[PDB]
Amino acid sequence: LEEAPWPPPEGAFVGFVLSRKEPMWADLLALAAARGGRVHRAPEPYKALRDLKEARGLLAKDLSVLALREGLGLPPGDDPMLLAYLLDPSNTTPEGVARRYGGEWTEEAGERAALSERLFANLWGRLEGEERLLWLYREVERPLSAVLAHMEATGVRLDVAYLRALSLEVAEEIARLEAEVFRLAGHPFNLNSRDQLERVLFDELGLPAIGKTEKTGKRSTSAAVLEALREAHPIVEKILQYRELTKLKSTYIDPLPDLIHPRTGRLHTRFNQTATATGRLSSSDPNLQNIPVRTPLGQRIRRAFIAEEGWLLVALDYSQIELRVLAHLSGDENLIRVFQEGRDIHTETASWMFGVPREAVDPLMRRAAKTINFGVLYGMSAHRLSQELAIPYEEAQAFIERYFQSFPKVRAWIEKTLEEGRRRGYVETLFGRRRYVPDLEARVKSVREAAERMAFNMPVQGTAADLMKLAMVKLFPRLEEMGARMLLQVHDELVLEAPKERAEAVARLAKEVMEGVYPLAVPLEVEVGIGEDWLSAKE
DNA sequence: GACCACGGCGCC
DNA sequence: AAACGGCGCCGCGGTC
Ligand SMILES: Nc1nc2c(ncn2[C@H]2C[C@H](O)[C@@H](COP(=O)(O)OP(=O)(O)OP(=O)(O)O)O2)c(=O)[nH]1
Ligand SMILES: [Mg+2]
Ligand SMILES: [Mg+2]
Ligand SMILES: [Mg+2]
C-alpha cells in the first residue's frame, strides 16, 4: 500500500493496537487506516481518533468503547469478525479469521487496517447470496455492536465498601470450616487442592469413590459426588460449605472491588460478540453474566450491584424462554396450549418434585425444576435424573417417558433437526444462524451422541439468543430518548438503569419491546422488576 | 510473571 | 458422576 499522510478519507478501514485486551483499561498504542490502495498511520493516535466518523474494521466495537471512554462518540460499523462469525461461529478470533480468509493478525496497526480491508472484501463475497445471514448482519449483529459499546463504556455501580466488609466476615467462617475439616481428617492439608482432598476422602478415610474425572480419570470430588456422600461421614457437609464460601470469596467478593475504573467509578465488563457456538453473547474481564443469585451468600453478593443515586435498576427476564422457543420451532400443539393457557412448567415440575402447592414453590425449588425440565429436554439420562430428583431409577425413567408423551411433536423436531445436520453438516436457528456439527456421523457412540445433544440444543438456545439481540437493537434508541441506560445482558435478561422519575415508564416500555420483538406461535412474557439493587429488582 | 489443562462451579 | 446444553474464572500443579 501507498503510504499517505494521516487523516484517512470517509469509509476507511481502521487498525489499532491496544496495550492490553480490555478496551476500558487499554492504552491506545497505535492507529492507522486503509482505503483506495493507501495506508495512513496516525502520528499520535488519541488525537487522531477525533478524525474518524466510525470504527470500521476488525474488533470495531473495542475501539468504539475506548473512544466512548475518551468522550468521543465513534460508533462501530462494519467488522469482518461479525461476517466470519455468521458464516461459521467457530470463527472467534482475529488470528483464526485472518488465517482462514486471507492474511495474518500482526501487532502493527497499519497491517491491521490493511488486513481489515482485505478480509472485509473476501468475507462480504462469501456472504453474497446468503440472504438470511446478511439479514442477521444488517438487522442484528452490526447494529448490536454499537449497543454493546455503549453498555461496556457505561458500566455498573458497585458497593465496594459492602463487599470489603463481607470479605472479612466470610474469611472468619471459612476458617471455622477448614479447621473442622482438618480436625476430622486428623491433619491439615491444602483443602483447595482436589488431588489432596481425593487422597484424604477415598484413601485415608473409608469413603467410596462415586465417579471419575473426564480427562485424567481421577476419583472425583465434585459437589454431586459429595452430595451422595453427605450421610457417609460428617466431613463432607463441611467440605461442601467450604467450597461454596471459597468459590464466592475468590471469584466475586475479593476481585470485583479492585476492578472499579478510576474515571467512571464503575465496573466495566466486555460483551464478547463472537465467542459462542450458539450465538449467545459472553461476558468477561470480569464476567458479569454469572454473578451469584441462588444461595443466601450469593444473594448477599448480588445486592452489591446498585443503581446510581437518583436512578433505579430495571431488570427484565423472559419467562420460560427456551420452552416457548421450542413450542414455536417444533409446533407441538400441547406445548403451544400450555403457554396459551398461561401455565408455568417450571413451577409445575417444582410443585410435583417437592410435593408442595404451587404457592409454596420457592426460588431454590424453581431452579431445581429448571435443571429437570431442560435436562430431560436436552437428553439427560434416567440414572442422573434419579439422583437429581432423589427418587428410584424406575420412577425417574417414567418421568422422561411422560414428558415426551405429553409433548409428542418435540421428538419429531429433534429427529428432523438431526438428519438435516447430518446431511447439511450444520443446524440453524429460526433466523438461519448456523452451527456446524461434524461429529454427527462419528462412529464412537459417546462422541456421536454428545454431538447430537449439541446440535439439537443450538436451534433453541440460538433462537432465544437471536430474539434477545433483536430486542436489544430495538430497545436501545428508545432508552436514549428517555435518558435511560442499558447496562447488562444475561442471556434472556436485561438490566437497565433509569432516572427515578422515568423508571416506571422505562420498565413498561422495555417489557413491551421485549415481548413484541418477533411474535411466535406462543406469547413471550417478560417478568420486570424495579429496585435499588439487582436482587431487589428481580423480586 | 505468564501460560496451560484440568477439575470444579458460578450463571443462563 | 451420571446420555442436559452454552459460557468464563478460580486454584492447583506444572511448566517455561
Ligand atoms: N440446557 C440448559 N439450559 C438452561 C439451564 N438454565 C437456563 N438455561 C437456558 C434455558 C432458559 O430458558 C434460558 C434462560 O434461563 P432462565 O434462568 O431465565 O430460565 P427461564 O427463562 O426458562 O425461566 P424463568 O421463567 O425466567 O425463571 O437459559 C440449564 O440448566 N440447562
Ligand atoms: Mg428467563
Ligand atoms: Mg434469566
Ligand atoms: Mg475447562
Nearest CA-CA partner of A104 in A192, A187, A15, A216: A15
What CA–CA distances, in Å, run from A96 to A23, A80, A100, A114, A130? 21, 12, 6, 16, 22
Please name the residue whose Cα sits nearest to atom 7 of ligand 1. A370
What CA–CA distances, in Å, run from A390 to A368, A384, A396? 12, 10, 9
Q: Which residues of A93-104 are buried (b: 16+ CB within 10 A; e: fewer)?
A: ebeebbebbebe
DSSP 8-class letter at A440: G
Nearest CA-CA partner of A134 in A59, A210, A82, A60: A82
**Beta strand ranges found along A190-341 (DSSP E):** 270-272, 282-284, 305-306, 311-318
**Annotation: CATH topology of A271-320+465-539:** Alpha-Beta Plaits (3.30.70)
Query: Are the C-beta atoms of residues A155 and A268 closer than 8 Å to each other?
Result: yes
Q: Which residues of A431-461 are buried (b: 16+ CB within 10 A; e: fewer)?
A: bebbbbbeebeeeeeeeeeebbebbbbbbbb
Extents of the domains making up chain A: 1-153, 154-270, 271-320+465-539, 321-464
H-type alpha helices, A292-425: 296-302, 321-330, 333-340, 345-354, 363-377, 382-389, 393-406, 409-424
CB count, 10 Å around CB of A209?
A: 15
CA angle A470, A144, A267 (to 5 degrees): 115
Protein side of the strand B interface (CB < 7 A): A 194, 198, 213-218, 220-224, 226, 243-244, 247-248, 251, 287, 289-295, 298, 367, 490-493
- Ligand 1 lined by A85 (C-beta under 6 Å): no
First CA to last CA distance, chain A:
59
Return the CATH superfamily for domain A1-153.
Answer: Ribonuclease H-like superfamily/Ribonuclease H (3.30.420.10)
What CA–CA distances, in Å, run from A419 to A414, A423, A460? 9, 6, 16
Task: Kindly report each contact of residues A297-301 with a partner whose C-beta sits within 8 Å and lies 24 or more positions away, as own/partner.
Answer: A297/A170, A297/A244, A297/A245, A297/A248, A298/A248, A299/A535, A300/A166, A301/A163, A301/A166, A301/A248, A301/A252, A301/A253
Q: How far is the CA of A193 from the centre of ligand 4 (A)?
A: 17
Ligand 1 mutation target, pool A280, A322, A457, most atoms within 8 A of CB:
A322
Would you say the C-beta of A91 is within 7 Å of strand C?
A: no
Nearest CA-CA partner of A83 in A62, A110, A106, A56: A56
Grid cell, residue A166, equals 463481607
- Ligand 1 lined by A322 (C-beta under 6 Å): yes
Which bases of chain C are contacted by protein, using any atom under 7 A from a CB?
Answer: 1-13
Q: Do domains A154-270 and A271-320+465-539 have the same CATH topology?
A: no
**Annotation: CATH topology of A154-270:** Taq DNA Polymerase; Chain T, domain 4 (1.20.1060)
